[PDB]
Every structure is written in structure tokens, then in C-alpha cells.
Amino acid sequence: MRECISIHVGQAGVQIGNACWELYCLEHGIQPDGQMPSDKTIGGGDDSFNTFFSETGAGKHVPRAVFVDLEPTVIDEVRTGTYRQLFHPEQLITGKEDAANNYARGHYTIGKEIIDLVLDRIRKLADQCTGLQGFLVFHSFGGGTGSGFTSLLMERLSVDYGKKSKLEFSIYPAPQVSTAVVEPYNSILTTHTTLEHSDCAFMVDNEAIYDICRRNLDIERPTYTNLNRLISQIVSSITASLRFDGALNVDLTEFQTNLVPYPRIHFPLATYAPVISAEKAYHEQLSVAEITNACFEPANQMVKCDPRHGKYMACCLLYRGDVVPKDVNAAIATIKTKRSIQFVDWCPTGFKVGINYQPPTVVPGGDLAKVQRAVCMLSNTTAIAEAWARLDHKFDLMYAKRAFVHWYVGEGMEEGEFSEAREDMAALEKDYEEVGVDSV
Amino acid sequence: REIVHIQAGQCGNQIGAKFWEVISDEHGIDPTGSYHGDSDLQLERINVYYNEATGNKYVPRAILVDLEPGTMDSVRSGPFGQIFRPDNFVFGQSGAGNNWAKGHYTEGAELVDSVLDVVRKESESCDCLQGFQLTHSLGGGTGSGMGTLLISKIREEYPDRIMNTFSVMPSPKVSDTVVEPYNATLSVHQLVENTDETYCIDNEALYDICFRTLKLTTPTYGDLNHLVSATMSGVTTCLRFPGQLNADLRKLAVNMVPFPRLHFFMPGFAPLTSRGSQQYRALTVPELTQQMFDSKNMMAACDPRHGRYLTVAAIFRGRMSMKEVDEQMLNVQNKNSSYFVEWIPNNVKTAVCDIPPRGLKMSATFIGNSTAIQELFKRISEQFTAMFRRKAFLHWYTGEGMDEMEFTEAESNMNDLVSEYQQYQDA
Ligand SMILES: Nc1nc2c(ncn2[C@@H]2O[C@H](COP(=O)(O)OP(=O)(O)OP(=O)(O)O)[C@@H](O)[C@H]2O)c(=O)[nH]1
Ligand SMILES: Nc1nc2c(ncn2[C@@H]2O[C@H](COP(=O)(O)OP(=O)(O)O)[C@@H](O)[C@H]2O)c(=O)[nH]1
Ligand SMILES: COC(=O)Nc1nc2ccc(C(=O)c3cccs3)cc2[nH]1
Ligand SMILES: [Ca+2]
Ligand SMILES: [Mg+2]
Ligand SMILES: [Mg+2]
């Protein structure tokens, strides 16, 4: 058992969902029609891939997933795309009019009209689980649906599913691939609202992904298609421990025990390696030592920040492919005596290590080279607070003049929700500062 | 003189399975449960750990417990997996997430009655149950949290029965999560109150032995457990085979435990062997004796020279001159009589069994009740405090209904235990 239900909210959430589930299918040998030849137990099973896939009597393997958007055109591409047979029509939910990059519309005006239907469809997935573990919520910070509706959904999920775990994959706004101006507002609002209802959240900075695609994959001007394929690999590395088995496999929940020292401190920094093109990977093996060392090169982080100017509270290494502990241990020993790695004084310094033997897969016609071994580092660093600081500052600049606020007030919100949300963010930044001060 | 065995959690079931496979080989029991050995000495006390099944099969008096089916399914598919009574597999589904509170208060509490039912069913078949033994780690949630809950309830239903534990102590060297000092500290106080013997098997020491001595550059849990099962075989040789000694658990404990709370033993074994690696020259008796007293064979990672021995027990196995054993034993003491308390006369005792373990022509198992064991608890205490100062990772516990006060109490009574050891070291 131990099923996980994925929920994809808004354009960013949905389209990243496409990338992930396509990648999952390739990893498990699941065809676009849902058929999986290597699976001999027809109509059910308790295999590791069953955490993410349910099974019909006709042998179809169905994602434990709901797609939600307040506007239909993004999800419509899923309904008519390559993997349309994968999903039951009731897993794909759309309204007619989006939130127009307005949190208020996503959380209130438009969201309330569809939230009951969404909870019903999620309930129908939960009822088919023999031991539901929790949820995975994919969304942007900047969208009106990604921010507003997600926080509404997270609030309702806490009511309907008690303390059942809820994890986030959140897209942090970058101007390079955005045409919105009010995203700092939506970002601060959803973070404040969701903070109590999320157990762990993986922020993905679009600028970090954009840079990596440009510098490492030599993509002149990355698209959402380019970003999502990279993001899906990081998401895959993180969920791999839930979907595959293995002696040296360590479950995500065990890493979570180390990553979250206080409820509010639940934002791990992800670093992934190797990201390399086919052209450059030819005749060039990337050893365990080489990719491990790349985890401490800030250019490979999912979020722009400098851990070398912060403190560590946890460090996890999630390997996949041709990797054995002996090589890991040696690589780590080298790094510990050559890197700027400093822990807070109230936390042990050892690196928690996981290894899945099944190697990384690539999507056909993608940009990433197929490699024999990859690694995702999940660290808890005070430096992640830099991402809050940049966002909060953009917020302050606009809010001082009350720019764009009338759009929010017009949909029923009050200025008091803004200041309250901002104060939570100020306290959050101070929390990250306080955990880094040495003990008495 | 039956003994009821219980193994709880991942670590508890893995060393437990190892234990049963080792002594089954010593008693000539195959994985089907059929005896095929060549000595009646193998069967004279086989009822201590085994039940006789109609159709002359021997079934381990063992109860297997976990909050998740993962490791127990590995057991059932293991080498001797089929030897265990299927009804004695008791498991939940939710797991414990390396959380003492989940094991002791919530998830474990929901399952603990089912385990007791099996315990009772095995006890009522015993002509005269002499006691219980438990294998578990202290660093996780099931073995640590539910294991001590189990021990508390067993003492309620069987207040006059001996309870002994083989307990794996956590170490940053061999570590799963950062909350292990929390779980260990909470568990240690339970053990102080409700066990008669606790064998302090330190994963740090087990690592160092595999590394520094057995020259295994990357030791696994499997390598670590080879040392544990070899030690458990030796500690229970006394009970499983005829010889000089025929004390029941209670008589054994009486002569080893001068004060009720100070019952945490430093185990040792000689010669130290890595799995598979044959070696052909047997040790001379002076070699056995010198090694078993050397800190490098200790499995508690405490320096015995930093404390004093209250009592010592040593069991030698194999065909050898016990007169020579006598002389070497009294050599070691009379050489180092400053590491033995002088107010417990003749506190160093020895015994021999003719039957050696598999692979060795002779061996020796060490059981030391030293005040140096306080180093183990001080180590755990320091690591506890470093996090608890900042109330770090506490939300995992408060979320299950626990209060900070219970941690403060746990911290305090382990510091009392430490100071209590210091009292007798300076006597
Ligand atoms: N990485 C990535 N980011 C995306 C993608 N699509 C949109 N975004 C980002 O999401 C933010 C805008 O939010 P959207 O997800 O498009 O909006 P929404 O959730 O549909 O909410 P609405 O306002 O109602 O449309 C911008 O910062 C975009 O850069 C995507 O496919 N991949
Ligand atoms: N010696 C030994 N220690 C183990 C083994 N498995 C886990 N441990 C240790 O036990 C602690 C984790 O507890 P675990 O038994 O996995 O948790 P549980 O299943 O909830 O009881 C850590 O300190 C590990 O180092 C094992 O097979 N052998
Ligand atoms: C399962 O519980 C035990 O085996 N406890 C136990 N406590 C013991 C104490 C001593 C000995 C032992 O072998 C001795 C050798 C010499 C004098 S006593 C053996 C012991 N076994
Ligand atoms: Ca199946
Ligand atoms: Mg949209
Ligand atoms: Mg474990």
C-alpha cells in the first residue's frame, strides 16, 4: 500500500504533471494506453509502483492523480494528448474562466465554485487506497489558480484528511519566463495561507532552471517544455524512493524526519546532477565523486541562494543508478574536507544517504543526456531564506503604493490579509535567522 | 526451563533472525524444523528455545513483531524463514517512522494487545517459563518505543519472570535519523526499571570492529549482525548445552547484578571473525583470554580501564585445558586487580562448554558488568542535550501527544543513572 495521490493545480502544476507522469511511465515500462506487460498481477497489486499507479481489471495502470485548472485549454491538451488514455475523464477537472493571476479569484470568487467537485474527485481516489500516505501538490506561486486555489485546497484537505501528509512542489516566480507583475502578491499570500497545512515544500526557482537549461544544456532560450523536463527529473529523483524498491533504498519520509527540525522550517533546497547534453556526455563518464561534488556547486541548485553563506541543518543524498556505498562514502569524505559546509551547533553533521538501483530515464527527443548515475541532494539550509527575502522585497515595493491591490479588494479581499500575510513572512525570515544562531 | 523470545522492529528482527539461524545450526535443526545432528548433547536442552511439534519438528519459541510488514516479509523469505510459527508473526501496516512516541503511545498501543495474546499462548505451553528475551534497537520507533511498551506490559502480567534484552545502541557513525538520541534516551529509562539484564550492543563498537580489526572497508548491517548473533550464541550457550553451568536466568542474574538499576552489560567475543573469511589456526588459551578483556573486542565502545568491574562472567567453548583457562583468567585479574572492585570477593567467574560454535575450534564470550558503561549513557546524553537545548525535532513527538516534560524527565533519570555508576567507581 502506502499510496500517494498527486494533485496538479493551474497551468504550471498541470504541465509539470504531464512531464512527470510521462517520465514515470517510461521508468516503469507503462505504455501510453496504460498497459504494462511486465506486470503479471492483473487488476491490482502491492508493488512499489502501485503507490503512484492504480490498476483496472483490463490491465490499465492509472495515475493516482487529479488535474485541476479554472480554465480548460491547458488540461484540454492532456485530454487530447499522447497520454489521454492514461487518465479517466473524471481525473481532469476544468472551469471556464481562470483567476487572471489574481489570488482572490483562485481562493474565493472562482475557486469556491469548483472546490467541492475537486474534493469529491480526490475522495474517489482516496477511497481506492488501502493505506493512503498523503498528497503531492504541484502549483505555481504566481498564478491565480496556482496560488489562490491551491491554498484553498490545502485548507480543505487539512479538514477532510486530518494530519495526513501534504507535500508541495512549488514554482517560484522568475521574470525571465513570466508576463505577470502581481506574482509577488500571490506568492506571499499562498505561502502564508499554506504554511500551516504543508509538511514539506520543494521550491523550484524558474530562474535557476532557466539558467541550468541555458548553461548546461546549451538551450538558447528555454521554454516551459525545456524547464518541465528538467523539473520532472528532480521530481522523479525525489519520488523514486516511493516508486521503486531496493535494499539501500531510503523512503522519502525518513529523509523528511531529518529535513524538518521545526514545522515552519520545511523548505528543502534541491540540487541535481548531472545535467549534461548528449554532445558533451559522449565519451565522458560522470563518476560518483564527480556528480556528488556537483551538488555543492550553487549553479546546480533548484533555488538561487548561497548555502556557503548560510548554515546547514540537514544534508541528504538521493542517488539513482550505478552507485554503491563505498564510492559514496569516499566522495563525501573528500567533499567534507574541501567544501564550505557548516552546520548549526544543535544538529549532527552526517549526510543521510539513499540509493535506488534503477538508473535515470530520459524522454525521447529531450535535451538531457542519458546517464548511468544521477544524484539529488536535499539540504536544509538557512540560505533558502534568501529566496523569501527577494520576494518579500518586491512585495514591499508595490504594497507601499498599494499597486494592483484594487484588483484583490474588488474580488472581496481586505488590506488586512496582505499585511497579515506579509508579517507571517517577516516572522518566517526571522525564524530562519534564529535557527542559525549558536546555542547558549 | 523454557525461554520466550521476542523480536521487535527492523533491527530487532534482523539480529533476531540471525540468532535463530545460528543456534538452529548448533542444535542441528534445518530450515524445515527437522533435527539432523549427530550428538544427543544437541537435544538435551533444545526445549529451552524450541517447541516440539507433532511430526517431530522443532519450532522456535519466538514472537516476531513490527509496525510495518517490510522486514518480517524479508524474514519469512529468509534462509530459516519457514521455521517460525506463522501465527507468531504480528505486524501492523502504518510503521513507526523512527518515532518512539508512535511505537510507545499511538501506533504501537493499537497493536500491543495482539502481541500479548501470542506471548500468553506460548507461556501457557511452558512447563516452567524461566524468562523472556527481547532483541531490538533503541534508535528507531518500533523496537525502541513499542519494545519497551511490550516490556512494561509483560512485567504487569508476569511480574515474577526474568526479562533480558539485547539492545542495539545508536551511533552517529551508523545512523539512520537524527532523532536516535531522543528515542534511545526515552528507552533507556524503561530498561533501567523493567529488565534484569540489558546487553548494550553499541553500533559504534560493532562498526569499529568490522573496520579497524576485521578490515572491512565498508561494513553493512549484515556484517554488524554477524558479531551480534555470534555473541548471543555465546551468552546463551550456558542455557542451551549441558556443562559446568545449569543456572536458570534468575540464578544467572543474581550473581551478576549487585544493584537493581546497574544491569547494563558490556558483551565481548573472541576470536573476532568476519563472515566467510575462514582462518585456520585456532587461538591458544592465553590468546583467547587476553583478547576478551581487550577493549577492541568490547561491543559497547566503552573503555573498561575508565571504570571498574562489578562482576565478570566468561564462557569458554571447545575442547581445551580448563586448568589452563583457570591460570590465564587469574592471570588477567591478578595483573589488573585495580579495575575490579574489591568489595565483591571472587567477582570473576568462568565456565566451559565442550561444543564450539560453527567455524571455530574454540571461542570465548565475555560478559562484563563495568561502571565504564556510563560512557555510553553520557555519550547519548550529550547528543540528546545538543538538540533538546533548542527543542529541535520535538514536533515529531508533540504531534503524537507527548510533552516536553517527559523528555526533561527522561534526560534527568539517565543523568541519575550516570552518577549512580560514578558512585561505585570511586568506592
Ligand atoms: N516551470 C514552469 N513554470 C510555469 C509553467 N507554466 C506557467 N509557469 C509559471 O507560472 C506562473 C504563472 O502562473 P500559471 O500557472 O500560468 O497561472 P495559473 O496557475 O494557471 O492561474 P491563472 O491566473 O488562473 O491562470 C509564471 O511565473 C510562469 O512562469 C510551466 O509549464 N513550467
Ligand atoms: N546492528 C544493527 N543495527 C541496526 C540494524 N537495523 C537498524 N539498526 C539500527 O537501529 C536504529 C534504527 O532502528 P530500526 O530498528 O530500524 O527502527 P524500528 O524498525 O522502528 O524499530 C539505528 O540506530 C540503526 O543504526 C541491523 O540490522 N543491525
Ligand atoms: C537470554 O538471556 C541470557 O542469556 N542471560 C545470561 N546471563 C548470563 C550470565 C552468565 C552467563 C555465563 O555463561 C557464565 C559463565 C561463567 C560464570 S556465568 C550466561 C548468561 N546468560
Ligand atoms: Ca499488478
Ligand atoms: Mg491559467
Ligand atoms: Mg529502520
Side-chain angles (χ1 to χ4, degrees), chain B residues 19-314:
Chain B
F19 169 78
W20 283 106
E21 100 184 35
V22 165
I23 64 167
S24 293
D25 172 79
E26 293 186 8
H27 288 274
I29 311 302
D30 61 24
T32 62
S34 303
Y35 174 70
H36 318 302
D38 50 67
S39 185
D40 293 347
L41 253 57
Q42 286 177 330
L43 285 173
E44 184 176 334
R45 296 201 212 176
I46 201 198
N47 69 302
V48 176
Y49 280 97
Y50 296 83
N51 271 309
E52 203 140 344
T54 273
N56 43 323
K57 236 130 202 62
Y58 296 92
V59 188
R61 201 169 294 101
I63 303 161
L64 296 81
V65 179
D66 214 338
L67 283 176
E68 68 183 1
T71 309
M72 274 172 50
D73 291 340
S74 278
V75 167
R76 198 149 24 208
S77 82
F80 276 74
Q82 294 301 319
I83 210 184
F84 297 105
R85 177 171 159 86
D87 289 344
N88 289 23
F89 287 83
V90 185
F91 60 100
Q93 295 286 335
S94 62
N98 295 289
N99 192 325
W100 195 85
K102 289 196 176 199
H104 200 85
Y105 286 134
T106 58
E107 308 293 343
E110 197 187 331
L111 185 77
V112 66
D113 280 11
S114 319
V115 180
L116 291 175
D117 292 335
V118 182
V119 173
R120 194 171 307 107
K121 188 167 184 176
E122 290 278 359
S123 287
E124 293 173 353
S125 297
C126 296
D127 183 43
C128 192
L129 177 70
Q130 48 167 327
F132 308 88
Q133 69 179 38
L134 168 73
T135 54
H136 64 294
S137 73
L138 306 189
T142 304
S144 191
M146 192 190 177
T148 52
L149 176 67
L150 261 169
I151 286 177
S152 193
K153 291 198 150 45
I154 287 182
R155 202 187 173 181
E156 193 177 43
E157 190 172 357
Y158 313 86
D160 66 335
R161 285 327 180 202
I162 295 300
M163 169 70 69
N164 296 335
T165 67
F166 304 86
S167 309
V168 174
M169 313 290 176
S171 173
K173 293 186 185 176
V174 197
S175 185
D176 287 8
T177 65
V178 298
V179 291
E180 285 163 0
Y182 280 156
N183 302 331
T185 300
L186 291 165
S187 273
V188 163
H189 181 56
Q190 303 297 309
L191 299 179
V192 167
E193 285 193 342
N194 303 326
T195 68
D196 299 284
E197 300 178 347
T198 289
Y199 294 84
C200 302
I201 305 169
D202 193 349
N203 259 3
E204 188 147 334
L206 298 184
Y207 181 87
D208 290 341
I209 288 180
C210 293
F211 183 63
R212 302 170 179 173
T213 294
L214 268 42
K215 302 303 180 186
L216 308 168
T217 34
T218 309
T220 64
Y221 278 130
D223 295 333
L224 266 49
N225 297 343
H226 163 75
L227 299 176
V228 174
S229 58
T231 304
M232 294 183 58
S233 170
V235 165
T236 64
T237 289
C238 166
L239 305 156
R240 294 183 292 106
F241 292 103
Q244 170 192 333
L245 228 55
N246 68 335
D248 63 353
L249 293 180
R250 182 178 288 98
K251 185 184 285 181
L252 289 172
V254 161
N255 291 310
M256 286 296 291
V257 189
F259 311 102
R261 282 160 44 92
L262 311 186
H263 57 266
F264 298 89
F265 297 162
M266 290 179 45
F269 185 88
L272 289 175
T273 59
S274 56
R275 136 188 62 196
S277 270
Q278 349 173 298
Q279 271 268 338
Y280 321 117
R281 60 180 297 273
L283 274 64
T284 70
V285 178
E287 289 176 333
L288 274 183
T289 305
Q290 162 250 325
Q291 288 186 23
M292 84 183 319
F293 272 99
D294 187 19
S295 72
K296 296 189 280 259
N297 297 47
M298 300 304 182
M299 309 198 166
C302 307
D303 183 11
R305 290 190 182 265
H306 290 158
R308 300 186 88 198
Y309 287 114
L310 300 170
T311 54
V312 174

Side-chain angles (χ1 to χ4, degrees), chain A residues 22 26 219 225-226 229 362-369:
Chain A
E22 173 181 11
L26 292 178
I219 301 179
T225 315
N226 299 122
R229 274 167 172 165
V362 290
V363 171
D367 302 279
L368 263 167

Side-chain angles (χ1 to χ4, degrees), chain A residues 10-12 15 98-101 140 143-146 177 183 206 224 228 231:
Chain A
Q11 177 176 318
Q15 280 177 3
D98 61 26
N101 292 172
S140 70
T145 304
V177 288
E183 294 184 280
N206 262 348
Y224 287 144
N228 296 346
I231 296 168

Side-chain angles (χ1 to χ4, degrees), chain A residues 2 260-262 352 434 437, chain B residues 94 176 178 386 390 393 395-396:
Chain A
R2 278 332 197 168
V260 187
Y262 309 92
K352 186 174 173 51
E434 282 171 346
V437 184
Chain B
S94 62
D176 287 8
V178 298
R390 309 289 292 268
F393 305 100
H395 72 96
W396 297 124

Side-chain angles (χ1 to χ4, degrees), chain A residues 66-86:
Chain A
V66 170
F67 288 68
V68 186
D69 204 357
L70 298 180
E71 168 263 332
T73 63
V74 184
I75 284 181
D76 277 345
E77 275 309 310
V78 181
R79 288 166 175 150
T80 62
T82 311
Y83 287 93
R84 67 186 176 281
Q85 301 180 67
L86 208 68

Side-chain angles (χ1 to χ4, degrees), chain A residues 414-433:
Chain A
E414 308 170 0
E415 298 198 348
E417 295 173 79
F418 281 72
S419 50
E420 169 188 301
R422 179 61 180 89
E423 285 167 10
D424 198 11
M425 295 302 298
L428 185 58
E429 288 199 45
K430 254 326 178 189
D431 288 331
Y432 273 94
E433 190 159 7

Side-chain angles (χ1 to χ4, degrees), chain A residues 300-317:
Chain A
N300 299 324
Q301 302 166 178
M302 289 335 114
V303 178
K304 309 264 278 196
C305 62
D306 202 344
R308 299 179 291 199
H309 293 319
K311 288 177 174 190
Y312 287 90
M313 288 169 283
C315 190
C316 306
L317 296 168

